[PDB]
Design a protein around this nucleic acid. Structure first.
Ligand SMILES: Cc1cc(/C=C/C#N)cc(C)c1Nc1ccnc(Nc2ccc(C#N)cc2)n1
Lengths: 547, 412
DNA sequence: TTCCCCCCCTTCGGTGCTTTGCACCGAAGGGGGGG
C-alpha cells in the first residue's frame, strides 16, 4: 500500500487516444549502467513499484540522472493551466531587510501522483551494459519531464505554504527554478528563527529544504536583473564596437539598447533602427551615417556611469514625468520621490501615417498608465510639458474620445503645442482658389491646377503620380502663390481628411511641404464640394486638368 | 434537491480560454473580500490546475451605492452555448413594450443564487483573480450556483420566474413584463405616483415569494427617430449653398427623390464664397420640396431578425453625441442624439459609456436584440477606463473604428 | 537544429473605404531577457 501526505490532482487524457511507443534514445553521461540500481533504490523508497502486463508502453532514456522522455506521451496528456506567465518587474518589489534561499530540488519527487493515473507513467526498458529482458516500472510521485507535473507541484506547494503565509504576511516566499527565496523585514538575529520554523513546517508536510550557498549571497542575478537588498539594476550591458556593422549586428544593438532603456534615462534608438529598412540579409553591410553615429555615441555616453533604481513603497504615491526628444520620441521617469526613480522608459511608436505632437502625448500617457496598472496597481500623477488650454482646445474639437488622469503642468521646454489652426469661417478679402488634380492609370500622367475668382489660372504636369497626389499637389499650388489669408475649394475629401486633422509629421514629403507652407500662413480656410456637378469654379479647373 | 438541466456546448466547439486584464489594487482587494464572503456560503468553489478554462472578471459599482460588485465577462461562453438558451429555452419578445408610457428596471440577480449549476458544466465557468505585479499566483474559482451574466441562466430560471410572477400578471394585466439577463423591465401607462407604488408592491411581492433583495424610470413615449432638416438662412451666400448642395448629395442616398440639379443654377460661375447670391424661385420651390421629403418615412425600411443590429456613435463636440442603429448601411432603423448632464466637467469616456448604456437599453426595449457598437475611441483607452464608470450587469459587443469622420451633418 | 512567454522594430496581408489606391490594423519573421 502506498502513502500520501498531500492531496492528489486527477488527470485525464484526450479522448480516443492511448499510450505510445518510443524508439530507444542515447542515455545520459554520468550514468550508463546504474539505471537498474537507481530503480531498485526508488522501489525501496516507494517512488517506483513494479506492475504486471498493464498495457503496451515503450519510453526512452533522456540524453543529472536518468530521465524518462514522455514526448510522445505528452501529446496525449490533458491540457493544464500555467501558473506564472508574466514575470514581476523589480520596480514593483517591496524592500525586504533580509533574504534566504532553500533548496526544493528533491521535494519535486515528494508530491504523490493520482492513484488512477499512476498506471500511465511506466518505464519499460532494460539495462544496457548487462543483459536483461526488462523490468516493470511506474511513478508513485510526480514524474520528471511531464507536461502537467510543474503546475501540479506549484499548486501543491502553494497549498502547503498558504497556512504559514496566513499567520505572518510580512515574510514573502517566491519559488523560482527549483529553490525558495524568503524575504523578511526581520534582522538576521530573528530571521533564523523564522527560517527554522518554515523548515519545520515544510518537513511536517514531507519536504526537506537544505541550502547553504545563496543564504548570504546578494545580488541574486534573476532573469536579467541584479536584485540587491534595497536596489536593483540590469545585468551588465555589452556594446559591440566593431567598425563594420552587418544587419544582424544592428538588430542585436537595437535590441540590447531597448532592453537597457528601462533603468538608464535618455536612451534614443530611433535613428539606428532606420538603417534596417529594406535590408533583410545578415551578410549585407550597411554603411553608417552621421545621425546614426551621433545617436549611437549618445547612447554609449550614458551606460558608462552606473545608476540603481529604488524599491517601491506602498505608503506613498508615484509620479510620472514625460519629456520630448524630437522626431516622435518620448522619455518618461516614474518616481515616488525626486532623484530616486522607480522606473524609466521610452516611447517612439509611429501610430499612423499622419499625426501631430498632442496625439503622441495622448498615446504616450496610455502606455505609462497601463504599465503602472500592471506593475504597481495605481495610476501615477502625470507631469506633462503641455498647457491646459492647448489640451482643452485639442480634445474638445477632436472626434475621438480620450482622457488623462490627474496631471499637472511643468515648464521644461521643448513644450508641446499645436503649430497651426485653420479657420471655421471664410475670410473677408481672401482670394478663393478652386483646385483640382487629375491622373491617368495608363499613361501615368497627371495635371494639377487651380482657377481663382480673379480669373488667374495655373496648370502643371506631373509624371508617375496618382489622383490623390495630384489633388494634394493642386492644394500645394494653391498655397504657393497666395497671400497670408487664403480660401481654397477642393472636390476631394481625402486631402480634407489629411489637412483637417492638422498633422505635424508625415511619411510622405508632399504633406510635410504642405504643413511647412501652412505654418507660414496666417489664416487658412478649406472647403469641400461634390464634383461632377459644375459647382463654382471646380468645373473650370476640372476641365483644365482634364483637357 | 432539484434536477439540473444538462447544459452542453455545440459538438465540435471547445470552451472559453480567454485571459484576464490587469486590475487596480482596490478592484482586487474588494474582489478578494467579496469572493471570500461568497466562499463562506458555498457559492463559488476553488479549482485546481486541471481546469484549463478562464473568463475575464472585473469589479464595478452601482449608483448611490459605495459597495463594490463583481462582474464576469461571459461574452464568449454565451456565444459557445448558442443553441441552448436561444432554441431550447428561448424567451418571447413582445412587440407592445414600446407603446408603454413608463418602463422601470429592476434587479433579479439574487434570485439566481438558488439554482445550482450542472456538474459537467462547472469547469467551463472558471475565473481567476490576479495579483499586483504577478508576485503571487492568481486565485482561481468556479461557479457552483447558476451564474449571473450568462445567457443560459434566464433560460433555466424562467420556469421558476413564471411561477413567481403569475399572480402579479393576473392581478395587473395592464403591465407588461420582460426579462433580459438579470434585468426585469416593467412597462405601464400609469402616472408617476401610481407607478412608484406599484413598483414597491412588486418589490414586496418578490420579497414575500422568497427573493433576497438588499429615479429609475424610462419613458419610451419620449423616443422618436430624429429627422434631418435642411438649413434655414435669412442671408444666403455661395458657401452656404455649397454646404447645402453637399448635404443634399449626401442625403440623396437615403432619399432617392432628393434633387440638386436646380441648386446648381446659382453656381454657374467662379464666384467668391463670401459674396451673396439672391435666391431664384425655382430653387426655392425645389428646396421646399426637399424639406417636405425630409419628413416622409424612408421607403424600403424593415426589420429582419436574421441579421444583427449595427450601432454607430459620432462625437459632435460640446459633450454631445449622435447615434444611428441600423442593419443595412444608409438604411437607419433608428437615430438619436444625446447631450450633457448635471456634471459641469466630468469626463469624455464616461459620457461615451453612458451613451452606450442608453443606446443598448433602448435597443433592448425596441427590439430585444443588442446591437454591436462602432465606438469612436482608442481601444487601449476604452479597455483601460470603461470599468471605472460602467454600472450595468452585462456587456455589449463592440468593434472599434479608425476612419476619418467628416460627419458634420448630424448636429448643427 | 526544440518549442513557448515577454518586449521591440519592420514586413506583409487582407479589410474598409476616400474605391485596382490608401489608411489602419493584426500577425508573421528577425533582435533582446530567461525557462
Ligand atoms: C520576485 C522575487 C524575486 C526574488 C529573487 C529571485 C531570484 N533569483 C525573490 C523574492 C522574495 C521575490 N518576491 C518579492 C516579493 C515582494 N517583495 C520583494 N522584494 C525584494 C526582492 C529581492 C530582494 C533581494 N535580494 C529583496 C527584496 N520580492
Amino acid at each position: 500500500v502506498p502513502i500520501s501526505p498531500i492531496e492528489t490532482v486527477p488527470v485525464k487524457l484526450k479522448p480516443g487516444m492511448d499510450g505510445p511507443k518510443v524508439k530507444q534514445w542515447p542515455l545520459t553521461e554520468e550514468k550508463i549502467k546504474a539505471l537498474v540500481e537507481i530503480c531498485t533504490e526508488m522501489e525501496k523508497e516507494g517512488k517506483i513499484s513494479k506492475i504486471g502486463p498493464e498495457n503496451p508502453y515503450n519510453t526512452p532514456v533522456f540524453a543529472w540522472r536518468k530521465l524518462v522522455d514522455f514526448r510522445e506521451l505528452n501529446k496525449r496528456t490533458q491540457d493544464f493551466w500555467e501558473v506564472q506567465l508574466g514575470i514581476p518587474h523589480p520596480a514593483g518589489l517591496k524592500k525586504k531587510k533580509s533574504v534566504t534561499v532553500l533548496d526544493v530540488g528533491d521535494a519535486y519527487f515528494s508530491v504523490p501522483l493520482d492513484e488512477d493515473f499512476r498506471k500511465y507513467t511506466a518505464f519499460t526498458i532494460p539495462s544496457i551494459n548487462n543483459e536483461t529482458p526488462g523490468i516493470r516500472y511506474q511513478y508513485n510521485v510526480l514524474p520528471q519531464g511531464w507536461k502537467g507535473s510543474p503546475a501540479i507541484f506549484q499548486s501543491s506547494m502553494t497549498k502547503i505554504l498558504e497556512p504559514f503565509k496566513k499567520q505572518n504576511p510580512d515574510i514573502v516566499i517566491y519559488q523560482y527554478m527549483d529553490d525558495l527565496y524568503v524575504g523578511s523585514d526581520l534582522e538576521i538575529g530573528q530571521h533564523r528563527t523564522k527560517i527554522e520554523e518554515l523548515r519545520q513546517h515544510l518537513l511536517r508536510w514531507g519536504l526537506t529544504t537544505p541550502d547553504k550557498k545563496h543564504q548570504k549571497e546578494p545580488p541574486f542575478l534573476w532573469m536579467g536583473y541584479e536584485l540587491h537588498p534595497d536596489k536593483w539594476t540590469v545585468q551588465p550591458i555589452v556594446l559591440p564596437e566593431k567598425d563594420s556593422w552587418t544587419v544582424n549586428d544592428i538588430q542585436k544593438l537595437v535590441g540590447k539598447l531597448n532592453w537597457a532603456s528601462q533603468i538608464y534615462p535618455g536612451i534614443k534608438v530611433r535613428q539606428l533602427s532606420k538603417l534596417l529598412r529594406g535590408t533583410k540579409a545578415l551578410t549585407e553591410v550597411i554603411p553608417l551615417t552621421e545621425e546614426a553615429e551621433l545617436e549611437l555615441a549618445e547612447n554609449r555616453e550614458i551606460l558608462k556611469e552606473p545608476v540603481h533604481g529604488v524599491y517601491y513603497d506602498p505608503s506613498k504615491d508615484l509620479i510620472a514625468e514625460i519629456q520630448k526628444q524630437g522626431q516622435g520620441q518620448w522619455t518618461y521617469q516614474i518616481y515616488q520621490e525626486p532623484f530616486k526613480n522607480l522606473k524609466t522608459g521610452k516611447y517612439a511608436r509611429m501610430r499612423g501615417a499622419h499625426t501631430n505632437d498632442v496625439k503622441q502625448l495622448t498615446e504616450a500617457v496610455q502606455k505609462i498608465t497601463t504599465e503602472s496598472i500592471v506593475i504597481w496597481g495605481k495610476t501615477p500623477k502625470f507631469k506633462l510639458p503641455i498647457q491646459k488650454e492647448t489640451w482643452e482646445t485639442w480634445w474638445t474639437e477632436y472626434w475621438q474620445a480620450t482622457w488623462i488622469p490627474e496631471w499637472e503642468f511643468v515648464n521644461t521646454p521643448p513644450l508641446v503645442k499645436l503649430w497651426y489652426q485653420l479657420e471655421k469661417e471664410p475670410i473677408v478679402g481672401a482670394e478663393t482658389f478652386y483646385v483640382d488634380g487629375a491622373a491617368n492609370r495608363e499613361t501615368k500622367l497627371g495635371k494639377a491646377g487651380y482657377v481663382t475668382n480673379k480669373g488667374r489660372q495655373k496648370v502643371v504636369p506631373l509624371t508617375n503620380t496618382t489622383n490623390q497626389k495630384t489633388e494634394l499637389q493642386a492644394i500645394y499650388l494653391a498655397l504657393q502663390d497666395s497671400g497670408l489669408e487664403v480660401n481654397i475649394v477642393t472636390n476631394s475629401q481625402y486631402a480634407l481628411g489629411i489637412i483637417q486633422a492638422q498633422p505635424d509629421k508625415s511619411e510622405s514629403e508632399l504633406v510635410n511641404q504642405i504643413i511647412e507652407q501652412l505654418i507660414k500662413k496666417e489664416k487658412v480656410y478649406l472647403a469641400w464640394v461634390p464634383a461632377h456637378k459644375g459647382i463654382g469654379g471646380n468645373e473650370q479647373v476640372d476641365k483644365l486638368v482634364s483637357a | 434537491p432539484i434536477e439540473t438541466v444538462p447544459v452542453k456546448l455545440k459538438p465540435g466547439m471547445d470552451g472559453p480560454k480567454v485571459k484576464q486584464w490587469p486590475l487596480t489594487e482596490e478592484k482586487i482587494k474588494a474582489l478578494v473580500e467579496i469572493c471570500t464572503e461568497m466562499e463562506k456560503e458555498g457559492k463559488i468553489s476553488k479549482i485546481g490546475p486541471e481546469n484549463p478554462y478562464n473568463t475575464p472578471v472585473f469589479a464595478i459599482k452601482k449608483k448611490d451605492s459605495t459597495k463594490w460588485r463583481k462582474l464576469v465577462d461571459f461574452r464568449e461562453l454565451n456565444k459557445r452555448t448558442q443553441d441552448f438558451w436561444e432554441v431550447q429555452l428561448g424567451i418571447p419578445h413582445p412587440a407592445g413594450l414600446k407603446k408603454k408610457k413608463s418602463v422601470t428596471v429592476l434587479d433579479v440577480g439574487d434570485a439566481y443564487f438558488s439554482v445550482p449549476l450542472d456538474e459537467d458544466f462547472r469547469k467551463y465557468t472558471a475565473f481567476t483573480i490576479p495579483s499586483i505585479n504577478n508576485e503571487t499566483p492568481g486565485i482561481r474559482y468556479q461557479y457552483n450556483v447558476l451564474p449571473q451574466g450568462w445567457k443560459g441562466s434566464p433560460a433555466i430560471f424562467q420556469s421558476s420566474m413564471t411561477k413567481i410572477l403569475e399572480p402579479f400578471k393576473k392581478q395587473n394585466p395592464d403591465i407588461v413584463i420582460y426579462q433580459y439577463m438579470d434585468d426585469l423591465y416593467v412597462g405601464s401607462d400609469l402616472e408617476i405616483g401610481q407607478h412608484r407604488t406599484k413598483i414597491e408592491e412588486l418589490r414586496q411581492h418578490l420579497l414575500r415569494w422568497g427573493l433576497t433583495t438588499p429615479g429609475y424610470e424610462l419613458h419610451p413615449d419620449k423616443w422618436t427617430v430624429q429627422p434631418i432638416v435642411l438649413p434655414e438662412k435669412d442671408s444666403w451666400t455661395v458657401n452656404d449653398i455649397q454646404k447645402l448642395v453637399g448635404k443634399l448629395n449626401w442625403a440623396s442616398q437615403i432619399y432617392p427623390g432628393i434633387k440638386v440639379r436646380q441648386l446648381s443654377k446659382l453656381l454657374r460661375g467662379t464666384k467668391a464664397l463670401t459674396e451673396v447670391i439672391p435666391l431664384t424661385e425655382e430653387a426655392e420651390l425645389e428646396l421646399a420640396e426637399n424639406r417636405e421629403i425630409l419628413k416622409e418615412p424612408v421607403h424600403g425600411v424593415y426589420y429582419d431578425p436574421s441579421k444583427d443590429l449595427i450601432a454607430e456613435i459620432q462625437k459632435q463636440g460640446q459633450g454631445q453625441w449622435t447615434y444611428q442603429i441600423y442593419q443595412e448601411p444608409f438604411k437607419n432603423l433608428k437615430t438619436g442624439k444625446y447631450a450633457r448632464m448635471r456634471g459641469a466637467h466630468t469626463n469624455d469616456v464616461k459620457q461615451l459609456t453612458e451613451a452606450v448604456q442608453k443606446i443598448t437599453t433602448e435597443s433592448i426595449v425596441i427590439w430585444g436584440k443588442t446591437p454591436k457598437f462602432k465606438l469612436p475611441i482608442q481601444k487601449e483607452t476604452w479597455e483601460t477606463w470603461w470599468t471605472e464608470y460602467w454600472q450595468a450587469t452585462w456587456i455589449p459587443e463592440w468593434e472599434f473604428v479608425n476612419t476619418p469622420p467628416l460627419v458634420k451633418l448630424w448636429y448643427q
